[PDB]
Amino acid sequence: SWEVGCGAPVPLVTCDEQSPYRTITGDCNNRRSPALGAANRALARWLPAEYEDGLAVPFGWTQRKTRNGFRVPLAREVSNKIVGYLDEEGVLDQNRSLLFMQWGQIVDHDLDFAPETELGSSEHSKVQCEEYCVQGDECFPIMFPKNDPKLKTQGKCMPFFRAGFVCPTPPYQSLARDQINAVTSFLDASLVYGSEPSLASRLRNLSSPLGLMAVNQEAWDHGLAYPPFNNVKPSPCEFINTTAHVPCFQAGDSRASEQILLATVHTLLLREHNRLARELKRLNPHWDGEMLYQEARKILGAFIQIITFRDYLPIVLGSEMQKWIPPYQGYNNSVDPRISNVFTFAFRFGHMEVPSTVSRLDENYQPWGPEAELPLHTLFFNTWRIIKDGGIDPLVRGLLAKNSKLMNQNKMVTSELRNKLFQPTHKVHGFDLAAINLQRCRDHGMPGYNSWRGFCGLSQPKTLKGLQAVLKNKVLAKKLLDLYKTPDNIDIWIGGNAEPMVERGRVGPLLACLLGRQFQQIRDGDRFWWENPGVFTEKQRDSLQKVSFSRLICDNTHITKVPLHAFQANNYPHDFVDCSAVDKLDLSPWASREN
Numbered sequence: 237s238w239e240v241g242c243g244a245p246v247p248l249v250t251c252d253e254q255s256p257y258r259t260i261t262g263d264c265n266n267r268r269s270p271a272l273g274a275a276n277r278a279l280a281r282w283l284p285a286e287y288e289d290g291l292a293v294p295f296g297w298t299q300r301k302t303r304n305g306f307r308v309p310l311a312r313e314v315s316n317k318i319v320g321y322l323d324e325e326g327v328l329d330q331n332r333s334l335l336f337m338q339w340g341q342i343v344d345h346d347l348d349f350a351p352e353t354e355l356g357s358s359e360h361s362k363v364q365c366e367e368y369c370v371q372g373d374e375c376f377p378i379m380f381p382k383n384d385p386k387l388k389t390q391g392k393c394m395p396f397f398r399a400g401f402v403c404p405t406p407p408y409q410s411l412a413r414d415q416i417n418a419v420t421s422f423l424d425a426s427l428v429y430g431s432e433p434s435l436a437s438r439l440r441n442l443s444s445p446l447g448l449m450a451v452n453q454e455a456w457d458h459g460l461a462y463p464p465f466n467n468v469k470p471s472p473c474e475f476i477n478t479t480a481h482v483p484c485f486q487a488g489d490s491r492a493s494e495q496i497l498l499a500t501v502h503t504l505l506l507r508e509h510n511r512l513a514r515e516l517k518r519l520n521p522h523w524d525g526e527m528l529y530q531e532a533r534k535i536l537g538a539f540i541q542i543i544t545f546r547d548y549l550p551i552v553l554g555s556e557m558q559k560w561i562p563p564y565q566g567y568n569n570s571v572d573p574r575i576s577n578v579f580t581f582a583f584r585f586g587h588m589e590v591p592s593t594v595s596r597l598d599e600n601y602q603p604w605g606p607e608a609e610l611p612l613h614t615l616f617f618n619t620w621r622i623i624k625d626g627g628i629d630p631l632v633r634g635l636l637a638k639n640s641k642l643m644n645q646n647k648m649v650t651s652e653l654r655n656k657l658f659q660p661t662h663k664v665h666g667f668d669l670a671a672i673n674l675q676r677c678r679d680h681g682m683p684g685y686n687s688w689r690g691f692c693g694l695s696q697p698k699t700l701k702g703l704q705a706v707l708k709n710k711v712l713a714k715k716l717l718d719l720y721k722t723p724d725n726i727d728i729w730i731g732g733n734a735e736p737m738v739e740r741g742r743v744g745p746l747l748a749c750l751l752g753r754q755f756q757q758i759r760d761g762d763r764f765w766w767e768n769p770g771v772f773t774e775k776q777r778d779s780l781q782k783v784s785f786s787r788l789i790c791d792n793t794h795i796t797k798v799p800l801h802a803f804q805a806n807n808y809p810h811d812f813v814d815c816s817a818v819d820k821l822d823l824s825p826w827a828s829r830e831n
């Protein structure tokens with residue numbers, strides 16, 4: 237053992253152990269090892285990390301240092317040759333609503349975040365990276381390949397900063413560099429409430445005993461709540477419209493406002509906590525502040541576990557759903573709840589499900605206004621279009637009535653993310669989400685494609701021919717072997733995403749395995765899973781078994797017509813029924829009467 241346990245973790249964390257509510261930090265879930273499943277620890281390593289020096293350095297950092305006797309291609313080149321595409325016609329998913337994309341990004345944010353390293357508070361190292369494109373330290377710039385239109389217009393590289401890691405922060409190893417997971421691994425609404433105590437209350441409304449979440453005071457949505465503004469300037473949401481002067485939001489998770497449609501969902505969620513607290517009180521007026529917030533918070537994590545596990549994963553995993561996640565068999569103490577370093581890349585399949593435009597729909601679900609359809613790239617860190625362009629209900633309608641993008645081997649990721657990404661502190665709509673992902677696999681030390689196929693007990697192509705049969709694509713196979721030179725070197729993100737989709741799901745076999753096992757572990761390692769006997773009353777569970785993403789829209793917007801199955805593709809008004817026809821979360825079983 238390199239080190240059996242390493243430094244840099246909050247020491248002052250201790251366990252009640254008979255309390256009914258999860259900690260904010262994830263700590264105390266597991267009794268045998270308390271730190272397991274908690275924020276600010278290291279991502280689990282299902283397989284030994286693979287670095288250039290075997291410790292912390294990434295493949296593609298030292299030019300002459302090959303991986304298996306071959307230079308790894310530049311991320312941007314893999315981006316340009318395989319990932320990109322021009323024609324947006326015929327890419328939409330006939331049977332996946334835009335909500336299908338959004339929910340994956342929401343679930344993913346609840347489960348994992350590996351942030352960039354610090355010490356850039358007043359760093360021109362941050363800038364040195366920006367301006368002179370010099371590779372050093374944590375500055376791991378993405379260099380453009382010769383023949384790249386960004387050479388001509390943007391400079392020599394796209395900045396990129398290595399992710400945070402445990403113990404020594406700048407910069408030390410061993411044990412071989414292990415990256416941080418800043419959020420709780422349990423599916424527990426951390427994205428509404430925060431994963432630090434400091435954030436969590438910062439966000440509660442403690443100016444009153446009602447247990448409500450702190451809302452916006454400087455703006456409203458037909459009298460409905462909006463998430464509070466984050467007052468940390470420099471703010472990028474201000475930076476996108478110097479005029480509009482509208483900052484990003486404050487949510488339990490830092491990425492809330494990365495695009496308007498994620499910000500939107502956050503909104504629906506905050507509204508759900510407040511909405512619920514008023515009710516707990518009405519039925520239980522005696523209940524204090526904490527009692528109200530804790531119990532609403534508990535209802536909420538349970539709602540996310542149900543939508544995720546009953547509605548969402550079956551349609552992501554397909555046939556592969558039972559092979560990996562069999563019907564719940566109760567809490568298992570031996571199960572390692574931690575998110576693995578590789579899941580955070582596996583879950584990135586969502587990137588190829590993001591479309592190039594967002595829509596606003598009116599009451600008749602028709603283009604609301606002159607400019608209802610907008611390019612995705614003018615919606616990164618855009619909050620002003622919610623508050624000042626007539627409200628969320630129309631973005632929510634877009635979500636129901638528009639279609640997710642289908643992953644496509646010849647059409648993987650839209651240019652909106654591929655050439656136009658806005659990243660905070662960097663100024664242009666000019667970054668590349670695909671290249672980022674690849675540079676990151678390398679930063680996080682991921683094992684190649686074949687290691688992961690090995691891990692999942694799948695065949696391991698060694699030849700152009702081999703790869704053709706697995707991907708079922710001759711040209712993709714060939715491009716990939718022309719750059720990688722062997723499948724042993726293919727970055728997992730691309731490797732996994734290249735595989736044709738399994739039956740009735742949205743990922744290949746490699747990912748259905750990577751995804752399948754992770755989620756199974758987070759459901760089986762949660763002392764607080766909702767269906768865990770003892771956590772809710774039988775009664776209470778028969779009341780949650782009814783919740784629906786349709787219901788969540790009804791109870792928290794002025795939309796009065798919704799689909800019954802929100803994630804399949806639903807055209808108005810055939811597939812649309814009035815809210816009246818939809819099952820309500822009967823909170824009656826939460827009555828706690830003293831006499």
Ligand code: HEM
Pocket residue numbers: 337338339340341344348349350351494495579580581583584585586587589590653669672673676
């Ligand atoms: C338009 C919507 C989206 C945008 C603009 C976006 C953008 C980003 C960005 C900038 C990062 C940070 C990458 C890095 O610096 O390494 C990221 C990471 C990630 N994305 Fe997305 N993404 C979107 C949608 C999604 C979806 C739909 C999914 C899954 C269904 C997803 C899953 C992830 C995951 C798991 C991470 C890594 C987070 C971590 O560090 O644990 N994203 N995305």
Ligand SMILES: *[C@@H]1O[C@H](CO)[C@@H](O[C@@H]2O[C@H](CO)[C@@H](O)[C@H](O)[C@H]2NC(C)=O)[C@H](O)[C@H]1NC(C)=O
Pocket residue numbers: 476477479480620624
């Ligand atoms: C910045 O925000 C303002 C709105 O806050 C945008 O201006 C609006 O756009 C049209 C006219 O151009 C009108 O329908 C709105 O009523 C305008 N409002 C105001 C105050 O001008 C403007 O387009 C945004 N700029 C950018 C670059 O996004």
Ligand SMILES: *[C@@H]1O[C@H](CO)[C@@H](O)[C@H](O)[C@H]1NC(C)=O
Pocket residue numbers: 441442443444446448449450451452453
């Ligand atoms: C806190 O709750 C009180 C009581 O409803 C309300 O008047 C106030 O607006 C809330 N404050 C904030 C900052 O959200």
Ligand SMILES: *[C@@H]1O[C@H](CO)[C@@H](O)[C@H](O)[C@H]1NC(C)=O
Pocket residue numbers: 567568569570571
């Ligand atoms: C508990 O999890 C461990 C780890 O796989 C394993 O022994 C077993 O399958 C599970 N079963 C029970 C009954 O806890």
Ligand SMILES: [Ca+2]
Pocket residue numbers: 346347419420421422423424425426427
């Ligand atoms: Ca979580």
